[PDB]
């Protein structure tokens, strides 16, 4: 006589049954049955200053949309890294060991924001 198709949520079942609705934890339950909220675990909204900002929600219908060109690794590399290496190659002051000079990161460990595995939310 039970309903098999509806979702299992905390509203159903006995009182002992409990489960979350998808909210991220903001603290720890210590011994003695005490909740201890952690300030670092609570997301902080980084909101910029919008004074003097010229961009608004919509755009002029007369504004031309551009040709779609999704960014690629090569496109990023040419814009940022290529000029430095090309200039250094002409001067001859280039070596394999010092790729970090141009912006290469040997490892993501020690960075606050790691690209892989990602350690920051959107």
């Amino acid at each position: 006589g039970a309903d098999r198709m509806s979702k299992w949520t905390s509203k159903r079942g006995p009182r002992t049954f409990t489960k979350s609705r998808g909210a991220k934890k903001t603290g720890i339950y210590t011994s003695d049955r005490k909740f201890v909220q952690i300030k670092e675990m609570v997301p902080e909204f980084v909101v910029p200053d919008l004074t003097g900002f010229k961009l608004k929600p919509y755009v002029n219908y007369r504004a031309p949309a551009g040709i779609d060109t999704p960014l690629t690794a090569k496109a990023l590399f040419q814009e940022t890294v290529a000029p430095a290496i090309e200039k250094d190659f002409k001067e001859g002051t280039f070596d394999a060991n010092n790729l970090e000079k141009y912006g290469f990161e040997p490892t993501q460990e020690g960075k606050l924001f790691q690209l892989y595995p990602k350690n920051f939310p959107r």
Partner: protein, 46 residues
């Protein structure tokens, strides 16, 4: 006495007797799940 009321609902009993974890505990139960997947059942277990 009057019959027909043999179902005495209890969610703890229902999930323990027929739930996901119960079915995967034995190979016979896993095969139960495989059969229901092959048929296309929307509900594989309680």
């Amino acid at each position: 006495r009057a019959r027909g009321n043999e179902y005495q609902p209890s969610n703890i009993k229902r999930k323990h007797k027929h739930g996901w974890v119960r079915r995967l505990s034995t190979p016979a139960g896993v095969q139960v799940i495989l059969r229901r997947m092959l048929k296309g059942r929307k509900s594989l277990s309680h």
